[PDB]
């Protein structure tokens, strides 16, 4: 209430500054509507915000638009440094309250914590998926807002840096909002790759080190008078930039070539800072014989000639100061190791030997033990676990190629380069037969030693894509690669078929293949596909007792509900993990879960716990999705919550999981699965004119405008752009539907269910958390906004439907309540419900100016009363204005494309989330 | 008793972790006696101590003089962090911001007249190699580690996680600076110590130059000027004199200056890129000039759409709607080239990379950068090009492409040498015995002509070739890179233009500013009339083109005369020099030559300042920051905004508002005593033939050289002014810094008693004459002839103590003359603090200063008997064998040098 008014007060009067009085009294006027329509319910007002909205000029409406942008961003950021400021004083969830409550609550003892914690793995995969609304340009200047509001309300500093930080917060805020906030150009694979490699960077890479020695501290005060060891991979970092081509043609071999050499560089220039640090530290003389014949041997190997361009340690290193002898040559064969990565990168040779550079991650480590070996048998312990043991932990976690590249693609684009090679041979149509007819003969070509793929085998573009990207995956480092990810994994058939286009290929050491279960029927037949699997004895042979199964929240609320999707993947879960205890096997499942309550998003710990009893068991990859890097890793405070809380929830879960659910809860929510799917389908499959309404009613068909990513009826859409038109309307219609009917059929087939609704609520964790995210989002929703792009966008004869689909609306959040405790919409947690009400008239206020906008496109002859303009910098119609014509040649009339792709970005800062 | 109780308590606990507790409680019972000692002047305790450091094991005597050096210097941390607590508090020693209101409202300046000031004032800080830092980088490095871990753990609002967190890494860092070798087994080579100045450079000094910029800028705003300081005011600059001087230093040869000259350019060009492509991402706005329009648009369209696979940011071609970036893109690959064409250069002598794709000038560099300034301006956008663009265009101009310009000095005898070997070999005579008038004449019809004269048939010595190999780097390396040339002890006219015939006939195309140091006191007496004579030949005037900059020795003069006389003389040699000056219409530039001891002419910035005469300065001054100093005044970011503020805030006080010249009879009495001063330090140092015995019997002066601080390898007159501080400094005598104070006083007031009264007005009124004893005290504060006793009485023979303890008599008369100068009952009455760290490091260093005495007569005197007892560590020879052929039997020279560097630490000054 207080960082708010801060920002927003230096931003008015830099608005004031630059653009005049009249554009900051138009936006303070805009709130002051807004706030009344959300303070009384007065319809009215939205009617006097389209007033006021319409009739701008080109120019003057940009402005609106951008300044409301820029107000719920700062909103934004005046929040983020709230909670940190809130949790610092808490101080004065936890990884050390984990471990007591472990240890002293629940009676587990000290040592089986401890054993947990060096058996735990939290694999974070980073991916680029197209949901980050802001351009890097502008989130960088994020950081630094908030890195001076922080410093700003320190209780140490002068009235003169008082004075200058303020200054410096003005200029910060004012660079942002003088930058183009839209992505006029597509990104390329390669750019969001650095995008998601710039937080490796900024915070991920120092981050873990910090955060490992913390759980060395808690567990030290539960007793365990041991360090964690550094070869414990508490948590690993993956990368969907680069190797997901899923959909994504401009994701080709040549880009997954250029994303793995260029992280291999990435790695090596962390690598080469931490050394050169560590050589200036180690300058003691005590070591082990093992090192000291080893500082000899490099010291008499290596002539003693000077390098004059070094900048530390130039001359030849003394073999008294034997850690600087070991690390001078870490050092140098770390040279060797970025350049050779540059040389590859820029043209595909180098000079310089794998010989002379580090290949492998055993190489590399061999003399950084040495020293933490060597330091330790001196007494010199102290000393080894400082810089060092970070060091040690970093190469652990991050390796020579900072994180691991998985791969993915679609399942029917290998079965069109098999029966392409089964037609062109003899043998027929890979594509006509029976799952059971390629299971079989796909394990005969597995086990033959019979090469199959031939020379002169005709391709397509799209057959040669798949064969080239094998190729690369051939010609890399295995370590550079993490697994071979299946969209759209139906049968064992889609998993045999890739392990066979591996071998067939040349990948001397083929990856881990992992199918993703993306729909309800592969969702249902998942534990079958994978019990077959488990059955065949060349898999069991391959796997050896380790199998990686993805399954995909996004997709799966988009088939069915997301009640029904939600409770489906509990069950798959479930069944597959009993499938793999049974024949033995590890199973590690892979969460696709975006930010959006509807794409399987929520709070970290509540998803979690949201996951059946004993299938994480310390083992378990969650994808972290476009936006969510940043909401996760955008600062050093953040990522030590995001890897406190995956670290914590996952061993509580293991040690102390959550409840099984009742039979008659099983019963009850298979049921009412099927009515939330029915229900949904109904709406969103059935209904032939849906999604003529869909279009009308939401920006669906301008997401793509804003240029997020690099990919070029319904079910042909894809599940971001679709969550995205129904936040942007606050509407949520994916989120809900279906909800409301499941509810309904279970209480008029008996009157008593609803006393079970209200026991499973109270007492089922699965079933708290999935109802309590669909309050969460009923607190964002309004369906007075849906109700006000109805009326201008939809035709006549689609509001009734519309008019239908808010019904529904009501009665699933009057349900939904009533089944929980509570009167209305976030009562025990007004913290998040304050933020909502002084972000949602700037939202509202957006709300209409898309609307009206999307009309003044759609309909070229609505009829506005021009209004004078109101900055002074566009006030006199001499020469074009230039933040106008910074989109040239455009589909639409000028500004309205700008403004409306503001809105969108605006509406997505408010709502926290794109899609 | 805070910070300081914390920082041994763990220390103490370390030691006795590794080593046993015996050897801990034996180092308790070492500060007991000598505490005790403090606090009584017991001469029987230090015998008794000396008793038991005596028949220490090899390996324990090492542990026991490390042990106290580790926990001195601990103390020295635990003091910096108190002081820079106790600074932060008193803002919630004059401000930037109070001094320009001082100035406009007190004294009656116009805000703008103020302004105007600080547009023309310059402080140029000057960086030497002077050997007087006692302390490894190694152990520097950790100390910056120490004292931030000691700040962090005493925030307002850390958990008792980062408490405990902080608290491991602050012991697992004392306990790397213990298990480090303290000596430095090998010397340094020049392009080493060049290393230890520009570390400073790189990390307190790149971003604080624009830093503190930025404070002068608010405080303009606070005085009512709206309006920023502009760019191009370098109101601080930085020179270096590492691989540059070379008097006394033949180790720096013609290739060592080429050396340090490109890897400057190279650093300079590593921090320029650092700051560009953070610039890069930053500056993103799309407004822009006409013509960085047009710029943006001619670099893009003449820019291949070719992409960089290996760059992080900015890969492809960055599109014209982003003209900042566009502009800023092309300086970056500017920059990658200067680099790498340094890199080439250093390694072997040539680059494939052409001059016309790099940087080669100031004004390249500058061009696009203020294109992008002026162009965010003119679009309303100044607040923004007030940010980064601003911090570096300050860095541009205040470090240029070399960082730092770097000064060259070579003494005036080694250019008559080759001059000499000139006329010999061209049988014109010998210009050795010439006169100084014929000298004059014979090099002004040389540089007035046109004919050649240096032969390449001319027979060299290796210094004759030294000193032409020197100027022929000089004219390969860039101009930009070099500030003046530097002759040490110029005595005449002749001096400077030897070296400016030596530059232009050794082929400098355009030769540097020649720069006499006028290092010794008959030289500074003539130094008005060598000056006179230069402003008044035709030729010199016209090449000087009104600016002159002479550079006036602080260290040798207090060692040819006393402290008392050469600040006196030094007082009037820049007095008469500026007068001579401003009737010849030249602006002087004056170069102090200040060392960090008071004996070398150090003292606090501000005092210093205050104690030179008024109109000297005027905007122009150039002062030496030599060795350990370079760590006191920038080892740390709010050090080097204190050491910034205080040259800046006193220089320009200076200006506006100077201190008060002395009244005539003041003159009259400082002339006499400066006689009676000299005569008092001559009589004692020159005269008497048994002093030089007397010294290297009773100070280890013999055995500096093993610190191996720098890279320098008879009689008296042949020692140099460190060796010679740091000798009295180590047994807390100081004999040079009051030598002839004391004669000087009693002369006055014996001659009349009246003259005590004019001494007590001094004082309190003339700053100079209050500067100069202030510091004197503060001497005096760490002096104790107890101690210099003790040495006599070990190492001194019986026929030289009586000679001893005269001068022992002579530092208790001079110190009570002093104080009653002063006025003061005891020794630093009003500053307490600082008088209680002494308290508390005296006794550790009254150990040291024993177990210094006691080694030293062990290997002097090879006879004499002590009796081992059982060691103390349980370790124990690996420490031992750290030094292999020691000229001294096993473990007495690393526990003398140990020695060495402990009582420097503790005194807090070495030379
Ligand atoms: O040896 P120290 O004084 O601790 O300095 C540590 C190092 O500093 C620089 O890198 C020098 O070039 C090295 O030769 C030296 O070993
Ligand atoms: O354009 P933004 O999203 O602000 O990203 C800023 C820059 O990021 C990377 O450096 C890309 O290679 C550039 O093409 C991009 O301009």
Redesign the pocket.
């Known amino acids: 209430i207080e960082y708010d008014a801060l920002l927003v007060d230096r931003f008015l009067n830099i608005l004031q500054d630059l653009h005049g009085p009249s554009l900051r009294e138009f936006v303070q006027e805009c709130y002051e509507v807004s706030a009344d329509y959300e303070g009384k319910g007065d319809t009215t007002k939205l009617g006097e915000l389209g007033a006021k909205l319409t009739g701008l000029a080109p120019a003057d409406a940009i402005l609106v638009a951008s300044s409301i942008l820029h107000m719920l961003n700062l909103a934004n950021l005046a929040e983020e440094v709230q909670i940190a400021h809130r949790r610092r004083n808490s101080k004065l969830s936890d990884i050390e309250e984990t471990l007591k409550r472990l240890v002293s609550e629940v009676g587990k003892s000290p040592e089986e914590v401890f054993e947990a914690l060096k058996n735990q793995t939290v694999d974070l995969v980073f991916t680029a998926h197209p949901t980050q609304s802001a351009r890097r340009s502008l989130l960088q200047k994020n950081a630094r807002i908030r890195n001076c509001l922080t410093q700003l309300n320190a209780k140490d500093i002068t009235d003169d840096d008082k004075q200058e930080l303020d200054e410096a917060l003005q200029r910060e805020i004012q660079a942002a909002f003088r930058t183009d906030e839209i992505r006029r150009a597509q990104p390329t694979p390669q750019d969001e790759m650095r995008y998601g490699m710039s937080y490796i960077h900024e915070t991920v890479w120092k981050g873990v080190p910090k955060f490992l020695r913390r759980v060395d501290t808690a567990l030290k005060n539960i007793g365990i008078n041991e360090r964690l060891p550094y070869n414990v991979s508490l948590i690993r970092f993956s990368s969907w930039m680069g190797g997901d081509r899923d959909g994504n043609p401009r994701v080709t071999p040549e880009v997954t070539r250029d994303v793995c050499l260029l992280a291999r560089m990435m790695a090596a220039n962390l690598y080469i800072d931490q050394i050169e640090e560590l050589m ?1 530290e180690l ?1 003691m003389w005590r070591c082990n014989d093992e090192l000291r014949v080893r500082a000899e041997e490099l010291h008499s190997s290596s002539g003693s000639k000077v390098t004059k361009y070094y ?5 030849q ?2 073999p008294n ?1 034997p850690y ?1 002898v070991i690390l001078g040559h870490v050092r140098d064969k770390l040279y060797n190791t970025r350049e050779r990565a540059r040389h590859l990168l820029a043209s595909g040779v180098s000079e310089i030997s794998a010989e002379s550079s580090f290949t492998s991650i055993e190489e590399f480590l061999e003399p950084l033990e040495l020293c933490y070996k060597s330091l330790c048998d001196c007494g010199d312990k102290a000393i080894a676990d400082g810089s060092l043991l970070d060091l040690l932990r970093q190469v652990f976690t991050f390796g020579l190629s900072l994180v691991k590249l998985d791969i993915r693609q679609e399942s029917e684009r290998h079965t069109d380069v098999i029966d392409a090679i089964t037609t062109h041979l003899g043998i027929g149509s890979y594509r006509e037969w029976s799952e059971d007819k390629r299971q079989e003969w796909l394990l005969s070509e597995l086990r033959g030693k019979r090469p199959l793929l031939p020379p002169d085998l005709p391709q397509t573009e799209e057959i040669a894509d798949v064969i080239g990207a094998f190729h690369v995956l051939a010609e890399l480092p295995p370590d550079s690669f993490g697994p071979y990810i299946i969209s759209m994994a139906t049968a064992p058939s889609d998993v045999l078929a890739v392990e066979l286009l591996q071998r067939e290929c040349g990948v001397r050491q083929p990856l881990p293949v992992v199918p993703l279960f993306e729909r309800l029927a592969d969702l249902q037949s998942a534990p079958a596909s994978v019990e077959r699997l488990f059955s065949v004895d060349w898999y069991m042979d391959r796997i050896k007792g380790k199998q990686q199964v993805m399954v995909g929240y996004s997709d799966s609320g988009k088939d069915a509900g997301r009640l029904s999707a939600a409770w489906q993947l509990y069950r798959a879960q479930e069944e597959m993990a009993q499938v793999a205890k049974r024949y033995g096997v590890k199973l590690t499942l892979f969460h696709g879960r975006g930010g959006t309550v509807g794409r399987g998003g929520g709070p970290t710990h509540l998803a979690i716990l949201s996951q059946p009893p004993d299938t994480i068991n310390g083992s378990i990859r969650v994808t972290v999705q476009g936006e969510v890097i940043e909401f996760c890793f955008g600062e050093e405070h953040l990522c030590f919550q995001t890897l406190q809380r995956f670290t914590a929830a996952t061993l509580e879960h293991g040690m102390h999981p959550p409840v099984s659910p009742k039979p008659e809860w099983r019963k009850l929510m298979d049921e009412m699965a099927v009515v939330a799917t029915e229900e949904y389908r109904s709406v969103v499959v059935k209904e032939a004119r849906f999604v003529e309404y869909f279009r009308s009613a939401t920006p669906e068909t301008e997401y793509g405008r804003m240029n997020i990513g690099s990919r070029p009826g319904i079910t042909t859409l894809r599940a971001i752009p679709w969550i995205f038109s129904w936040t942007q309307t606050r509407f949520h219609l994916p989120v809900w539907l279906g909800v409301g009917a499941a509810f309904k059929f279970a209480i008029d087939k008996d009157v008593r269910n609803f006393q079970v609704l209200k026991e499973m609520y109270n007492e089922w964790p699965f079933f708290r958390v999935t109802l309590d995210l669909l309050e969460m989002v009923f607190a964002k929703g309004d369906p007075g906004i849906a109700g006000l792009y109805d009326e201008l966008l939809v035709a006549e004869e689609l509001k009734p439907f519309g008019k239908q689909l808010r019904d529904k609306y009501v009665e699933t959040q009057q349900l939904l309540l009533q089944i929980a405790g509570h009167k209305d919409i976030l009562e025990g947690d007004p913290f998040l419900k304050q933020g909502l009400v002084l972000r949602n008239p700037y939202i509202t206020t957006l709300n209409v100016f898309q609307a009206y906008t999307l009309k003044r496109i759609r309909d070229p002859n609505f009829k506005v009363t021009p209004q004078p303009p109101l900055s002074k910098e566009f006030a006199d119609e001499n020469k074009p204005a230039g933040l106008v014509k910074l989109n040239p040649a455009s589909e639409y009339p000028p500004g309205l494309e700008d403004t409306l792709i503001l809105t969108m970005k605006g509406i997505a800062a408010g709502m926290q989330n794109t899609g």
């Open positions: 200036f300058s900048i530390e340690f130039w001359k290193i003394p100061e600087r």
